[PDB]
CSV table of C-alpha atoms in Angstrom, one decimal:
chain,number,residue,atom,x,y,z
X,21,UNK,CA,113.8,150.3,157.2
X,22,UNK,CA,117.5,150.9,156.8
X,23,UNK,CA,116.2,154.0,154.7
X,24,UNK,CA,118.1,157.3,154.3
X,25,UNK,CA,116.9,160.2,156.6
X,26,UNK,CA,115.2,162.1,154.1
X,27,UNK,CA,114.2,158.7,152.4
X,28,UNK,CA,111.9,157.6,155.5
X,29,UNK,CA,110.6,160.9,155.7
X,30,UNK,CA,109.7,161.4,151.8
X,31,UNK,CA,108.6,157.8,152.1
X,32,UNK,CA,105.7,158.7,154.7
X,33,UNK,CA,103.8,161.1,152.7
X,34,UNK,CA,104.0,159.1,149.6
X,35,UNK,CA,103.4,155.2,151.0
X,36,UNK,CA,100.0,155.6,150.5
X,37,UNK,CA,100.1,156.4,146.9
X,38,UNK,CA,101.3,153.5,145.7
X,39,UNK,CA,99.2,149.9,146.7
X,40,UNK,CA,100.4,146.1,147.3
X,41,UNK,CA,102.7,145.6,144.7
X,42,UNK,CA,103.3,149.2,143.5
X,43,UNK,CA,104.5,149.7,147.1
X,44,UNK,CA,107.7,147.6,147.2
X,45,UNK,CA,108.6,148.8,143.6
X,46,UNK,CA,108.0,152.6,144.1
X,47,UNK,CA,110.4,151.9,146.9
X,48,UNK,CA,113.6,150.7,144.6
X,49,UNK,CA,112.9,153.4,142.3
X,50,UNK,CA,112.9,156.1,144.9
X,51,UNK,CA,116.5,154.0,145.2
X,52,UNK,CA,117.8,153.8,141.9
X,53,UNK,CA,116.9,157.3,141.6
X,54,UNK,CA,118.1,159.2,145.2
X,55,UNK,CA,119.9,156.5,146.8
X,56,UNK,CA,122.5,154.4,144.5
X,57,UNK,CA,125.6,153.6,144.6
X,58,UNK,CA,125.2,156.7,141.7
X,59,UNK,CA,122.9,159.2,140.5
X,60,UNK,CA,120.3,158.8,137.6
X,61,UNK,CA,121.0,159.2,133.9
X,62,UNK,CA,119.4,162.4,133.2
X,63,UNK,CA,117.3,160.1,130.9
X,64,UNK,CA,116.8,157.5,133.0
X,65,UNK,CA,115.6,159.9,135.7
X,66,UNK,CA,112.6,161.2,133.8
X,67,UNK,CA,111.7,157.0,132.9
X,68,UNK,CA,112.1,156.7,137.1
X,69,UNK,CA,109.6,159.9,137.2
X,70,UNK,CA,106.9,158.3,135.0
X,71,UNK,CA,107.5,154.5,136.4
X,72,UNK,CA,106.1,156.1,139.8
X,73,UNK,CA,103.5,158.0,138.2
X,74,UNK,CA,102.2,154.8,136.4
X,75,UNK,CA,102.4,153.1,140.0
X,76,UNK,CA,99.9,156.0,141.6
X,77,UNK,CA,96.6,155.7,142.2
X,78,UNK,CA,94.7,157.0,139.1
X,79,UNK,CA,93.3,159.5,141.6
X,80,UNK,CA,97.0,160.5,142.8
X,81,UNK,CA,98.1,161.6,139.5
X,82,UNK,CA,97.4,164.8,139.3
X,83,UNK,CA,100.2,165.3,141.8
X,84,UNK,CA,102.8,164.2,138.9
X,85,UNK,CA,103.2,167.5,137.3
X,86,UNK,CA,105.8,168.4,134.5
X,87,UNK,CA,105.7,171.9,132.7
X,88,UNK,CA,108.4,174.5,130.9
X,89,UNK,CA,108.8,177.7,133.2
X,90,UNK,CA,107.4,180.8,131.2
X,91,UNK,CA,106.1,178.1,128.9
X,92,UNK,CA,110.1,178.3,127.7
X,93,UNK,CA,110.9,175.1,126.5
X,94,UNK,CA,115.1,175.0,127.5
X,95,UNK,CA,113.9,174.1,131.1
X,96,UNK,CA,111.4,171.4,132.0
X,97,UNK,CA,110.4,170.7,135.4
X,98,UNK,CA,109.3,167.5,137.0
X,99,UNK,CA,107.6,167.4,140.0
X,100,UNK,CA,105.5,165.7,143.3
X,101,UNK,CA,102.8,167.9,145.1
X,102,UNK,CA,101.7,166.8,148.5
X,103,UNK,CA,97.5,166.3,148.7
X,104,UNK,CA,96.9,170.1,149.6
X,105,UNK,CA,99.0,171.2,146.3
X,106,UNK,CA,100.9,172.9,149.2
X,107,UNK,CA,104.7,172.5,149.0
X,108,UNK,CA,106.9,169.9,146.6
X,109,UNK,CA,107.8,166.4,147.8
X,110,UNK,CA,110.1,165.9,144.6
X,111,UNK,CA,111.2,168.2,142.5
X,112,UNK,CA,113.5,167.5,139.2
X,113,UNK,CA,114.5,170.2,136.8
X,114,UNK,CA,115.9,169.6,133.8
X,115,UNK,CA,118.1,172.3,131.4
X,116,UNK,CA,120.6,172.5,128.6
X,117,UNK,CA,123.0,170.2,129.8
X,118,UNK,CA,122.6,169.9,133.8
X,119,UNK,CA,119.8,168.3,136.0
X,120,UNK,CA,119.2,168.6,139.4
X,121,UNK,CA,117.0,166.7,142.2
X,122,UNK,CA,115.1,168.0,145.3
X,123,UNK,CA,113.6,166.4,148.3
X,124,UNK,CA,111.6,168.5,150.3
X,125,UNK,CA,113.6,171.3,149.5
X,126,UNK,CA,116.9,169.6,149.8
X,127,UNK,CA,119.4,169.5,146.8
X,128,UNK,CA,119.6,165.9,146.8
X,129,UNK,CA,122.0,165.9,143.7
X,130,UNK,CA,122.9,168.2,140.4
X,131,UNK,CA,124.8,166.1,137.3
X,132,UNK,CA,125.9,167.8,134.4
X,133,UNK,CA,126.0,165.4,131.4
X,134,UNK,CA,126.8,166.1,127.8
X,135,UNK,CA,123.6,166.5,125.6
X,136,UNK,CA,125.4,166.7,122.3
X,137,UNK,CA,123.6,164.6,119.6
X,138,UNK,CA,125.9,165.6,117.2
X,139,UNK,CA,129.2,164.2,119.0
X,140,UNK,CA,130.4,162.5,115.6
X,141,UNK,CA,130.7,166.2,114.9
X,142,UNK,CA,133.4,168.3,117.1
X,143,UNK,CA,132.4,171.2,114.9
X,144,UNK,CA,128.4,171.0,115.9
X,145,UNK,CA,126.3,171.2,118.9
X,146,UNK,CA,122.8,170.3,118.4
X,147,UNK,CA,120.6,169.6,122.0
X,148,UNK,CA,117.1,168.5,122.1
X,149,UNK,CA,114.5,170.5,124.1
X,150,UNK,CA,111.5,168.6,125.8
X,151,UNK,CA,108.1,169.7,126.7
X,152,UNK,CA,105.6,167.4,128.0
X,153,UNK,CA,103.3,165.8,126.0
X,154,UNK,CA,99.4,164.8,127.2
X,155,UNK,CA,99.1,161.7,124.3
X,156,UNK,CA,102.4,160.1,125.4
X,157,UNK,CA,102.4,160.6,129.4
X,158,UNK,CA,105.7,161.8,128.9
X,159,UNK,CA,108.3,164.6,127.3
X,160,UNK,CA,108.6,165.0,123.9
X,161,UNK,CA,111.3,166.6,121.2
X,162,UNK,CA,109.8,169.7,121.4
X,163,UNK,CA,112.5,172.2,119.8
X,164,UNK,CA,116.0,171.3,117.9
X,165,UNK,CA,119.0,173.6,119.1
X,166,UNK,CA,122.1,174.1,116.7
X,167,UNK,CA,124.8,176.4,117.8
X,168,UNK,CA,127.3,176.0,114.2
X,169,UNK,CA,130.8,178.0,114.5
X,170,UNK,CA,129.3,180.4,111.6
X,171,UNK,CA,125.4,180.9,113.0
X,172,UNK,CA,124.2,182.2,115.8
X,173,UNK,CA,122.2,179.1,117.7
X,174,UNK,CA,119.0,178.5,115.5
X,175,UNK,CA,116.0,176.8,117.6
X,176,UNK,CA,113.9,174.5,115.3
X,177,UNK,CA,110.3,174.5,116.3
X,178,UNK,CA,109.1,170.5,116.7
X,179,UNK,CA,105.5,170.8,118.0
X,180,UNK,CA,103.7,168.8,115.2
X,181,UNK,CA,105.6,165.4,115.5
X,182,UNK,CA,103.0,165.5,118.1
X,183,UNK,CA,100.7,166.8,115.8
X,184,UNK,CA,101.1,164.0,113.4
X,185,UNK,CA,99.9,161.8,116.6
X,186,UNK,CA,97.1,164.2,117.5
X,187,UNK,CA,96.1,163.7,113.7
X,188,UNK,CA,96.2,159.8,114.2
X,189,UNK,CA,94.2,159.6,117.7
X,190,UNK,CA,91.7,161.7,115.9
X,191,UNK,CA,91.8,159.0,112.8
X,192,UNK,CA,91.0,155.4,113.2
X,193,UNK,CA,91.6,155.1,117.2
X,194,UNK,CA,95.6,155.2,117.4
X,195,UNK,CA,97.0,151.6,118.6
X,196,UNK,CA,96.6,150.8,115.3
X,197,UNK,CA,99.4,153.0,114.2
X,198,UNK,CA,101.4,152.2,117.5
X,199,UNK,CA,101.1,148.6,116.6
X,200,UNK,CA,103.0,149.2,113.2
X,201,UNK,CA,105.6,151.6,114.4
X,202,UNK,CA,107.4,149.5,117.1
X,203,UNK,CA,107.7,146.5,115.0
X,204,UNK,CA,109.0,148.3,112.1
X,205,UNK,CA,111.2,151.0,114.0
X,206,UNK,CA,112.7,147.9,115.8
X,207,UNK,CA,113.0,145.5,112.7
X,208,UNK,CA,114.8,148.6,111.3
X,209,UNK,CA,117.2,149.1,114.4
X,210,UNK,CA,118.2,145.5,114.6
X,211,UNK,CA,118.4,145.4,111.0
X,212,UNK,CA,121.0,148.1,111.2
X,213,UNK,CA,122.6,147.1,114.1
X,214,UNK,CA,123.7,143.8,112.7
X,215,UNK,CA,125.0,144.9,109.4
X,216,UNK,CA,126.9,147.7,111.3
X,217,UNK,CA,128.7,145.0,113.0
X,218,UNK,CA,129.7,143.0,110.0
X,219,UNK,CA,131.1,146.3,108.7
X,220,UNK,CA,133.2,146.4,111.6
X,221,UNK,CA,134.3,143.0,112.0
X,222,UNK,CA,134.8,142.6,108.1
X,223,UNK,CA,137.8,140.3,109.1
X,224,UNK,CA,135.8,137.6,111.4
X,225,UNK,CA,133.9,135.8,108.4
X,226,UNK,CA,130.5,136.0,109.9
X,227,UNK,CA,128.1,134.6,108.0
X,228,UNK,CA,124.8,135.4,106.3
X,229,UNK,CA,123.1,133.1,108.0
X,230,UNK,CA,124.4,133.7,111.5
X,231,UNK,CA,123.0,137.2,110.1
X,232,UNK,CA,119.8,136.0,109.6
X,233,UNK,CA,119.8,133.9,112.5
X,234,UNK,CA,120.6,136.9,114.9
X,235,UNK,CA,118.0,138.8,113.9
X,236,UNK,CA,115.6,136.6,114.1
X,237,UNK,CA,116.7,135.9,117.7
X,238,UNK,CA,116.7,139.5,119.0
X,239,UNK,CA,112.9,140.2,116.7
X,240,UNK,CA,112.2,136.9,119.0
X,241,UNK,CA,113.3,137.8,122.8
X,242,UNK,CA,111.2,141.0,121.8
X,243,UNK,CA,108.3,139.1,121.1
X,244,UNK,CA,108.4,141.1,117.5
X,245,UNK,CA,106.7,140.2,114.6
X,246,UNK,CA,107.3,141.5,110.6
X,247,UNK,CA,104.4,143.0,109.2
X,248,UNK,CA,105.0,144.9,108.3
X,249,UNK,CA,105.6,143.1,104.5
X,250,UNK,CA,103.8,144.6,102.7
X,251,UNK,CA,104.2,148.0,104.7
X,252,UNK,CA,100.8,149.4,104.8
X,253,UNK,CA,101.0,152.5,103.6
X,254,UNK,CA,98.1,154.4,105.6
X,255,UNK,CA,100.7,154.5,108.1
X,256,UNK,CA,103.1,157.7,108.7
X,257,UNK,CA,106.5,157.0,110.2
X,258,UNK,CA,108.3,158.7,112.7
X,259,UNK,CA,111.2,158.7,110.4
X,260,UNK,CA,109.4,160.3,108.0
X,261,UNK,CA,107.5,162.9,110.0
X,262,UNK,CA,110.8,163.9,111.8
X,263,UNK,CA,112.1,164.7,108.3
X,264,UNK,CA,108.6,166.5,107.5
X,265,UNK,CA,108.8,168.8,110.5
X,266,UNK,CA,112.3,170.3,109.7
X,267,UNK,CA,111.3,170.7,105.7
X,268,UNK,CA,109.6,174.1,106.1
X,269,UNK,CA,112.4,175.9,108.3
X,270,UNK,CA,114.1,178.8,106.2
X,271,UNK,CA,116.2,178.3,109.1
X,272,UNK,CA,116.9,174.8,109.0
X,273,UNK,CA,116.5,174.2,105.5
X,274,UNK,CA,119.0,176.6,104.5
X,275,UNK,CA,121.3,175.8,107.4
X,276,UNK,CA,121.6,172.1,105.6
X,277,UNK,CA,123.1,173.9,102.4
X,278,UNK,CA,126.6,175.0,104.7
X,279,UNK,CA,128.8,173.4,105.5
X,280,UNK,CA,128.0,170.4,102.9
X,281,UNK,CA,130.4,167.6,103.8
X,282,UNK,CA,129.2,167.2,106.4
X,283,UNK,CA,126.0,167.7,103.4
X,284,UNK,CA,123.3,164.8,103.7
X,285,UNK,CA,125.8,162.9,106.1
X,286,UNK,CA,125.2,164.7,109.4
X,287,UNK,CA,121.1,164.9,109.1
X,288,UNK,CA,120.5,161.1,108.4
X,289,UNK,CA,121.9,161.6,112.5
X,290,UNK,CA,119.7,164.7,113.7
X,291,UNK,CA,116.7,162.7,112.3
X,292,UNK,CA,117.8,159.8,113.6
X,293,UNK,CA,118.7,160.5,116.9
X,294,UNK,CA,115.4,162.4,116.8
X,295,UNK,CA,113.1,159.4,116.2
X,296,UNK,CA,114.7,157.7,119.2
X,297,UNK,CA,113.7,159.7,121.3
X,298,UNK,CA,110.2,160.3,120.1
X,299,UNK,CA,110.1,156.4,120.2
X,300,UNK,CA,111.3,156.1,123.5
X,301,UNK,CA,108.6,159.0,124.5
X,302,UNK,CA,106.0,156.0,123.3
X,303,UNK,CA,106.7,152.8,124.2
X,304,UNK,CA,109.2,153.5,127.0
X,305,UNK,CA,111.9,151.4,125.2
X,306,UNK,CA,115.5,152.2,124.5
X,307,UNK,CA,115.7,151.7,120.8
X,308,UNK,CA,119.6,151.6,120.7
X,309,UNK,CA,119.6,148.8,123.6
X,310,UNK,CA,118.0,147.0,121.6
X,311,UNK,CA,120.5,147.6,118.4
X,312,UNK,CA,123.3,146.7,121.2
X,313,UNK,CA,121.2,143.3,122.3
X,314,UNK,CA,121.4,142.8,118.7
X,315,UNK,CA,125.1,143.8,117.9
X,316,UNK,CA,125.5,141.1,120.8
X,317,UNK,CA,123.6,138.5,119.3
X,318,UNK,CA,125.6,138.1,116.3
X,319,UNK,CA,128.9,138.8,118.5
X,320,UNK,CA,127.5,135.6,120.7
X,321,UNK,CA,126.3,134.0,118.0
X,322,UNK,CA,129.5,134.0,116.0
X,323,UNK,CA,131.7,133.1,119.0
X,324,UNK,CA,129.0,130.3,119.3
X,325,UNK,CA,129.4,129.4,115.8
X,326,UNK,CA,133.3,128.0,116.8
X,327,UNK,CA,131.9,125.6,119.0
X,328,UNK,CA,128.9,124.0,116.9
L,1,UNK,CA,136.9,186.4,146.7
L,2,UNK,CA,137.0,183.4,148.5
L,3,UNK,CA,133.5,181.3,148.7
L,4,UNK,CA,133.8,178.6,151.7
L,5,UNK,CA,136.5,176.9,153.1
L,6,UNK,CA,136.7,174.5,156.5
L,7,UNK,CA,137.3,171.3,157.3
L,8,UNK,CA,135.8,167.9,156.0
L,9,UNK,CA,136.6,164.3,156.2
L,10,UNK,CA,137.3,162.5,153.2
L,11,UNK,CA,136.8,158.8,152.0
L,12,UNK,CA,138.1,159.6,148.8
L,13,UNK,CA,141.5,159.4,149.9
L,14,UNK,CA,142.4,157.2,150.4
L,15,UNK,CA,141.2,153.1,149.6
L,16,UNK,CA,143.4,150.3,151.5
L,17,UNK,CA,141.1,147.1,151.9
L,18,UNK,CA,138.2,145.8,153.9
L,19,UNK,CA,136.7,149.5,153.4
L,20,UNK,CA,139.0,152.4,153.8
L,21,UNK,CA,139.6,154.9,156.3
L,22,UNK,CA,137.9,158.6,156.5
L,23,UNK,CA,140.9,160.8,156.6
L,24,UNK,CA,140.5,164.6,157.4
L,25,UNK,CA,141.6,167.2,154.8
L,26,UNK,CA,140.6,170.8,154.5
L,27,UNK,CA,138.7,172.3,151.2
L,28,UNK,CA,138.8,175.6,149.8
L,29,UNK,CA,136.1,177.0,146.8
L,30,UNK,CA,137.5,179.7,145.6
L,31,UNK,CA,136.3,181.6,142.6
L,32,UNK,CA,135.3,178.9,140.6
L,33,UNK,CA,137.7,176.3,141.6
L,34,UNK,CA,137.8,173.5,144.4
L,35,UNK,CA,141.1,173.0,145.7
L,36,UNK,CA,141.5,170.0,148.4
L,37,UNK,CA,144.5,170.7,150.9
L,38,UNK,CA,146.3,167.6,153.3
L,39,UNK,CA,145.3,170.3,156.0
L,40,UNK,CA,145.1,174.0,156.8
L,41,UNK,CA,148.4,174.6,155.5
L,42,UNK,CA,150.4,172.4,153.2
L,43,UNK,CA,150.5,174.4,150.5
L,44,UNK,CA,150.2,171.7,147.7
L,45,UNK,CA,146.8,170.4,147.2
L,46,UNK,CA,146.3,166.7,147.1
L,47,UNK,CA,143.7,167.5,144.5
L,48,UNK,CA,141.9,170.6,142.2
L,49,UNK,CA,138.9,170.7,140.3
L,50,UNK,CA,137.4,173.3,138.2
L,51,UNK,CA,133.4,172.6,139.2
L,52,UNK,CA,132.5,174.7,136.2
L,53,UNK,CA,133.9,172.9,133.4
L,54,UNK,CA,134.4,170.0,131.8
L,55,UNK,CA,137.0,167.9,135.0
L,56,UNK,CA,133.2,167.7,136.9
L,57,UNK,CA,130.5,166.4,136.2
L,58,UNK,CA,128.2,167.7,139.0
L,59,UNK,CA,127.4,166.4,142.8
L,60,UNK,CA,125.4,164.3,145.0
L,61,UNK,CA,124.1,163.7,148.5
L,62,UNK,CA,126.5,160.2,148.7
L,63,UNK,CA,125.0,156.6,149.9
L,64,UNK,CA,125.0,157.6,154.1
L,65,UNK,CA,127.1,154.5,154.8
L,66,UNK,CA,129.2,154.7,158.1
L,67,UNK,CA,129.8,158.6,158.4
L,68,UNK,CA,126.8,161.5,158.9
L,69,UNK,CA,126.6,164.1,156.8
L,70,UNK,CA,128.4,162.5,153.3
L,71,UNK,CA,128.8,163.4,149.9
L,72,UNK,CA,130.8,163.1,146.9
L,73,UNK,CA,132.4,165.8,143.9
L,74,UNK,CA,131.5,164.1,140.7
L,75,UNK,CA,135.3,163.5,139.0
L,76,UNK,CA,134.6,161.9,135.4
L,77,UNK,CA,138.3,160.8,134.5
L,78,UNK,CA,137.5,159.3,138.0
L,79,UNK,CA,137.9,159.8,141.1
L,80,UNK,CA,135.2,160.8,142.8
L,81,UNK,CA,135.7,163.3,146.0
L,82,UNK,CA,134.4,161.6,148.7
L,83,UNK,CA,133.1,164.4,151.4
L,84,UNK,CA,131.7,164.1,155.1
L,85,UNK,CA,131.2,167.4,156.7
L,86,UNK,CA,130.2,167.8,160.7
L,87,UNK,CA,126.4,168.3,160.7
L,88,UNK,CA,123.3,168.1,158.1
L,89,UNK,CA,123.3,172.1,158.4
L,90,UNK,CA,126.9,172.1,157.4
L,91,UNK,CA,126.3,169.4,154.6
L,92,UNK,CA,123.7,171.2,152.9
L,93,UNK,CA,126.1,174.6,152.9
L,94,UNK,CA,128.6,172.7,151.1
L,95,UNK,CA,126.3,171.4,148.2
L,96,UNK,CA,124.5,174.3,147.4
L,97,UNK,CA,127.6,176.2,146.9
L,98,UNK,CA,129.4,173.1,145.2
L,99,UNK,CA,126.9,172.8,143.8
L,100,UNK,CA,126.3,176.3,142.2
L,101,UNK,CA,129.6,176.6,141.0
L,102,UNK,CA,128.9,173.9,138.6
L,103,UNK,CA,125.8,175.6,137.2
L,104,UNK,CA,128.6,178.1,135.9
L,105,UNK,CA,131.4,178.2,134.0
């Protein structure tokens, strides 16, 4: 009970949502999130959002509300309603590149990160816009923003990645498709994560088998498995439908074709960093931490490979 | 067009050992710009921040450790502005305008 002030309080009309075990771990996320040594990645504070809302009671969840002001997508607001829908417990808000957090009405903290995708590029902002999405439980890349030194800042319309999933429910009944994705998108990013290593560390002679051996490790620790061979092709990948969605744009197709150096190079990262994010909106998993684990198994493993 | 000034205590400054102590200083936000003065008139300020651009990266309500009403001026090449005002009232004054400025530019 060596809670905060406003901790205790926010605690007493929210103990009761959470049962048992749910209790003690609601608890450390209402930590991590108001009350650590620092405030939330603006990120990690929506995960912190949704870890509570799995912990409610199936009938307390219809107090975890999330919706764009105006419908307006370059705000999205994440919030707690007390039982009578009368006043906000929590309250998160989310813009262009700050995010702020209120208890009961206090401003408990406001961060202003960097939302640049395009950071490779000094030339190029591009930020993602979220909207929540009812088949995920969570936000979704919902509209692209590019601001280019030579265009004004063209939005991109992304509504139907999640109609490629609302297409997929309606097919065979979905897990099917959710069981290929995350152990190819994963294969891929480990995949890619070692040979980006070697590229760096040319010099250090690591091997093709310490390679292999890595990978296999981190598709291990996982608990991933590869078929994937042969790819069945009744399947649509978020890769893929990421690239789909941004075909038919005379705005974004025609934006590509300027600037073109700088030509195929910088959308194999808008996709990209994309698919992340629509991947993390489905399994709740941090693709790149994963591709780091990775980079660090064959880092570890070569440094291992001087001893044995 | 000044925006608030008074006095605070700050952690921030400085850090022995075995803790630190809370040493007073007094804070102006003026236009968009935090300046942090020794006290209410050495003219050179131990420290300024412009909260609307990129020297900031926001605030928070800090970790209530030994002192009341705390806070702390996100600095990202690294301090950060440790803050305790007075009272709650006088806590909440300071981070709604702090943090306002911030929202800016």
């Amino acid at each position: 009970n060596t809670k905060e002030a406003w901790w205790k309080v926010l605690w007493e009309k929210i103990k009761d949502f959470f049962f048992s075990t749910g209790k003690a771990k609601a608890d450390r996320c209402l930590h991590e999130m108001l009350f650590a040594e620092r405030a939330p990645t603006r990120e990690r504070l929506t995960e912190i959002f949704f870890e509570l809302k799995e912990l409610a009671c199936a009938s307390q969840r219809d107090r975890f509300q999330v919706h764009n002001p105006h419908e307006n997508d370059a705000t999205i607001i994440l919030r707690i309603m007390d039982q009578n829908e009368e006043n906000e417990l929590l309250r998160i808000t989310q813009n262009t590149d700050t995010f702020s957090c209120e208890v009961m009405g206090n401003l408990y903290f406001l961060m202003k990160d960097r939302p640049d995708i395009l950071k490779s590029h000094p030339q190029m902002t591009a930020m993602i816009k979220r909207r929540y999405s009812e088949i995920v439980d969570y936000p979704l890349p919902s509209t692209l923003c590019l601001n280019p030194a030579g265009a004004p800042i063209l939005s991109v319309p992304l509504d139907n990645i999640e109609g490629y999933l609302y297409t997929e429910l309606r097919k065979g009944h979905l897990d099917g498709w959710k069981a290929q994705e995350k152990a190819t998108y994963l294969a891929a990013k480990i995949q890619s994560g070692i040979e980006k290593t070697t590229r760096i560390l040319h010099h250090a002679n690591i091997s093709e088998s310490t390679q292999q051996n890595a990978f296999l490790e981190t598709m291990a620790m996982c608990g991933l498995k590869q078929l994937e061979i042969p790819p069945p092709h009744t399947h649509i990948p978020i890769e893929k439908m990421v690239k789909e969605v941004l075909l038919a744009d005379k705005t974004f197709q025609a934006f590509l074709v300027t600037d073109p150096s700088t030509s195929q190079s910088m959308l194999a990262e808008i996709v990209e960093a994309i698919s992340d994010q629509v991947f993390h909106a489905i399994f709740r998993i941090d693709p790149q931490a994963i591709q780091k684990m990775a980079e660090e198994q064959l880092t570890t493993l070569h440094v291992r490979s001087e001893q044995q | 067009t000044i925006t608030k000034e008074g006095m605070l205590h700050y952690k921030a400054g400085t850090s022995y050992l075995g803790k630190e102590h809370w040493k007073t200083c007094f804070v102006v936000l003026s236009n968009g710009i935090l300046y942090q003065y020794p006290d209410r008139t050495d003219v050179i300020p131990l420290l300024s921040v412009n909260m609307g651009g990129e020297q900031c990266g926001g605030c928070r309500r800090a970790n209530t450790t030994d002192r009341p009403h705390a806070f702390q001026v996100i600095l990202s090449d690294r301090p950060c502005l440790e803050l305790s005002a007075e009272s709650e009232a006088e806590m909440a004054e300071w981070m709604q305008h702090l943090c306002q400025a911030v929202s800016k530019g």
